[model samples]
Target: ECTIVPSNHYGPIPGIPVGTMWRFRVQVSESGVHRPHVAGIHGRSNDGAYSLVLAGGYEDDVDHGNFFTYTGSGGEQSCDQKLTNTNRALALNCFAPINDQEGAEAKDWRSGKPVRVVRNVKGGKNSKYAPAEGNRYDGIYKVVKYWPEKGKSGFLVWRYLLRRDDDEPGPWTKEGKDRIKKLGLTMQYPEGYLEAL
Candidate 1:
């Protein structure tokens, strides 16, 4: 199956730092951090969203330093779940397993399951904080809440409110900037990638 299942039970994938980044979706998939190249949401229909890519797919989505509002998939009603395989094999590492029908909420927002947040460069043109190049891992964020709404696309879209919960400094913070500079965490490409281009 092309579906990728998360190996861990919950929380952020161990050892991945805030500034770690990759240039392509395949690289992120290989890292087991997130799967799906074009799909924005990666998760099981029975559970909840484990991770998502912020590419400014919706003009209304908002991004703040520690908190961000994300739009759900499905611009057209028919393209909703069927197009993404009904969120079949995408599993999450959560403290309490999710129930899609009822959709679970964290008692303590901080205690909620961590969702690996990735931002693609394509979103940069629409966003001020998007990475200048490639997909960047900004570290763990917890889904504070999620609900359905009528989006500008005129489709019922599931929206999520995520908040930064990791101990590592956020990329927009001064400390994080210094850390990124000190570590020299720049965009990465596959071996012989430049030559191929």
Candidate 2:
């Protein structure tokens, strides 16, 4: 069924390291235990103040500032197939939002909060791929905050602050960088990617 799988937050295989000022390449496909259409990548933006998401159906696939929002849980759910964008707010731990969204209210729900790693869990519209009937851990995703709002596409969506979580090294932490050096994790391109570029 549906199972949460762990991969490199930088979109690399697990056990890799990330670097500051790092650029990564990722793929969104529907061939795994995790549903592809619901698949998205969450990472820190270049500015390093807010987390970002590249969701497929967000704002009808629009990559604009308005297309992005805070992430969290708790919202109205409906079987109605209508697309509507509602506004939600993210709750901040402190007045200062660091590498996260400052808008929206934060919820107390553990699952609805930001996690430290990127975990691919089973939920969403693709229950067909879910393993068992419980929540699955995809990766570690840190909660930047929660924004309850409708996307530009008009679908009520919850946005959460997420950063790539992996054992690999990233520039944000010294331990990560050292681990990467010791583990020998480097940049990798998916198959046939080099040729395509």
Candidate 3:
């Protein structure tokens, strides 16, 4: 194909809505909610992260309903961590007038990039919004702010705060529950998963 494809953007996918479900990482990867099959943040170091997956990858992570905190990569193992690709990508999602070394603040939070938020089932410990069996798109979220904090290893880790913004409520909400019951999206398995049988 010689045509150019739009691989990344700063907002939700065109048709993918809140509570869109996918069993495999690649399912959502190609679906365009989140592109990286492994990396948590998907975007360029120079631009904002288009989407992110939260699957309990860190012990320091915590999500309180609509707003949540996300920690940077593992370079902070008791040693001072530096802002690398993934970290910088998330920081760029904040307002452009933010920080470089110490993280930055959002002058107008919504003015920041809109990152599509998806949660795998494993993140249940951190948030009730996580799915029961696979990954599900929660909704679009905006980075409220970012800063550095000391981790268990006494090393500094970059943490970012994001709050949900969507016309549809989260899947965990009573309104969302009723909505999903109507959408009736069931789990889908990759072809290879059942080939051996």
Candidate 4:
């Protein structure tokens, strides 16, 4: 059932292959992989960002297998000046806990923390590498580094550098594709809702 609270007892749920895909954010949340829907980030405010969704919200953001750069939230500094959890969660993943004032670099990049990376197809129009449909899980990535920078939106935002650190074969690889096929993993739908449609 999709209701199962994914076992986070171990770092990154096991048996879920690198190319796993789901139709909704709630499904991902139920899996315990990530718990936020509209919010791009999910994590304890003080701890760090446990995961983030790469929806290509920023035009300047770069995405490549093995490594990628993510942009921070906040449409414009002048309109909505309030910094919410979504903005603060990911920035805290840096080496030193930042108060979100000045940009700081991670002392030990690899030592920062692990973050689950999810990709939504909505951003695929901007990014060539994003999945064609639904939200796909690309496996675990570590926040190797982060810093603040002026964004294309003309606002100073925090950015993060994530590196692939998991052992699972990347979705682009033949091995991972084979595993996904063998597992029979497919996009899921809400129970009893399909018949209604």
Candidate 5:
């Protein structure tokens, strides 16, 4: 799979209009599209719920100063000190709050969902390309695994595996190709993206 683009291209996705709803799962990838210096992806706004973010390289030796732990789980050590990847480096966090109308399931990365990624992209960062910073409407991912580890930074970092979950319809999958044509869902780049690309 080919990685999508990363941040610095789109500003932000407009909030879902009031009375709108969608059911979606959250997935994170270190590779693909410009992988942020830090790690993790999520909604930053306080008004809505931000999907959980699982970042790799959260160890003290690896992260050093990139990641930090803000909230700790119950019974967990207060000073357990997980890596916090909010340094605003190579990493970028973006999210889409699902409306109730999209599906019944709530978008929760902590739920151990399965997501895929475009593992190989020419000139992309990380192992694969990361998702774009804005207008991430067509990118599809599936959660594969979740675990905590001492990141290279030395501190513990929560990490998850995301797999590529999209099947583009081209000459091979004629039906899928035709479906995409009918849906009219082309890559919806963020505003001003064309000029940037």
Candidate 6:
């Protein structure tokens, strides 16, 4: 209610490109891309998951550019995850058909709630598409499927499958590179930060 981003808005922020990069999370909120600074999915338990973030929080995640698998919320410090909080919110992003026990796939993957995805420069080679600097607005994605399985830690981990839904070529391919160059896109530094550096 206190944010400039309209509460009802649930897609890409206006006048920003997929290459939009911010040095901090606060800007993410002020820009209205991903409103919550709470880390990861930014939605309540009842509705849909409108946004998500990737900042090296989940080492087990697999980001392959077009589609990837991501872990859900809860039990971060080595414990069994619960489908109570943001986890359920993310699940709601998929078309309605919840089965907490076995989880469920999208009734219509393309028709699911769209998620504005943010990618920060992670420190590893896990994802080649993650921006080389700051956090970048990669684009929208859809929850293709959801499932529950025992994680590497042997605890119950809820995972979701995400597929790129954006029409633009990703920041990876040569075509996107050409387009971004023409668009004058580059790593953006907020005013004064670069000078302070």
Top lDDT model? 3
Computed on alpha carbons, the lDDT of every model, listed in order, comes to 0.66, 0.31, 0.80, 0.70, 0.28, 0.79
Off by over 4 Å in 4: 1-10, 75-84, 96-102
Best-to-worst order by TM-score is: 3, 6, 4, 1, 2, 5
Alpha carbon lDDT at 118, candidate 3:
91
Q: Against the true structure, what is each candidate's TM-score?
A: 0.77, 0.33, 0.89, 0.81, 0.30, 0.89
State the lDDT of candidate 5 residue by residue for 69-185, as single tens digits.
Answer: 222121123333332332111111212232222212224433432221121121123212223232122223433333354444444444433332334422124564465556654
Off by over 4 Å in 3: 1-5, 76-78, 191-197
Candidate 6: Cα lDDT at 125: 55
Q: 1 or 3, which is superior by lDDT?
A: 3
Q: Compared with the true structure, what per-residue lDDT tens digits does model 3 show for residues 72-186? A: 7856385776676878888888875657677788768888788889999889877776788899898989988888888788788888889988888888899988998898866
TM-score of 1: 0.77
Between prediction 1 and prediction 4, which has the larger lDDT?
A: 4
Supply the TM-score for candidate 6. Answer: 0.89
Q: Count the backbone clashes (under 3 Å) in each candidate.
A: 2, 56, 0, 0, 49, 0
lDDT tens string, model 2, 1-197?
11234321222322222321111213222112223333233322231211222322333222221112333322344422221221121233212343233343334333332322222223223223222322222333333344435654454554544333344433334665475467553434446767899
Q: Which residue pairs clash in candidate 6?
A: none
Of candidate 3, the 10-residue stretch with the lowest lDDT total is 1-10
Provide the global lDDT of candidate 3 against the true structure. 0.80
lDDT of 4 by residue, 1-197 (tens): 22344322224655556687878888777766667667877776555677778887575677887788876666536443223465566666666756555556666776666788888898786777688888888877876656666665566666667787778887777888888888888887766567798
